Amino acid sequence: GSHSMRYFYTAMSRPGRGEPRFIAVGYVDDTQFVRFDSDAASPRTEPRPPWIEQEGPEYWDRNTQIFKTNTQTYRESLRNLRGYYNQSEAGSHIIQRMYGCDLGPDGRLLRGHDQSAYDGKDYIALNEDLSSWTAADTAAQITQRKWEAARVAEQLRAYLEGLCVEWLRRYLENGKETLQRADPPKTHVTHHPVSDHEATLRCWALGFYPAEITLTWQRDGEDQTQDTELVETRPAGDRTFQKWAAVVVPSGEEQRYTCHVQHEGLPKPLTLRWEP
């Protein structure tokens, strides 16, 4: 599909250094729109994109009430998981949670999501049916039963199909000039000899939004999958992203190589070559 909303929660214990810290951020695609940190002076949910500022006091109070309760709730959960795993009170641990909804180009719900991890490894996840759970081990099963008893899955299904899609669509309209605008990448190829017999061709993509992009090198039209070095897509700081793909080629053979770029902001897919 084309759009999604996601909330990311991180709860971290720090024995001997105060109570566990809770941080929450909200994103619509690759655009962050809200934040909350329990370590702030006057913890409150703050705006992170201009289009959210127009929301009323009730919106901000409701978010803050929820996030302040989350801070308490997660302190209790970190205590609970420590016990489910028979761990010492001396170690630091982290519970992460990520949930939200995906919309297709038609605007209707493609699928819902809800997953949690403990120390960076899967713990419990709502299944695609939005009705059952997948617990990773006997400890997660304890959490599963509590949730089944509280009819959590039913409330999650209702949120994901109701409120989540409704707010997402509201945000996509209010922030349409940016959220619904794909900025194509500016591309170019550089050359750096690596020896008297080989050189590096690096294909650049700059200033694009959203982050989703495909950069590939071909030699005689054949994809150089195992021979292409790809860097992780990185943020520029102005909402856009950067990325590059490099291949080391024999000197005098650079014209046999073509870089192909696909991005949704592009009228049609690009093919580039080094221009001496």
Partner: peptide, 8 residues
């Protein structure tokens, strides 16, 4: 708005 809080 975000999801309702819950304990693990």
């Amino acid at each position: 708005v975000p999801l309702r809080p819950m304990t693990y």
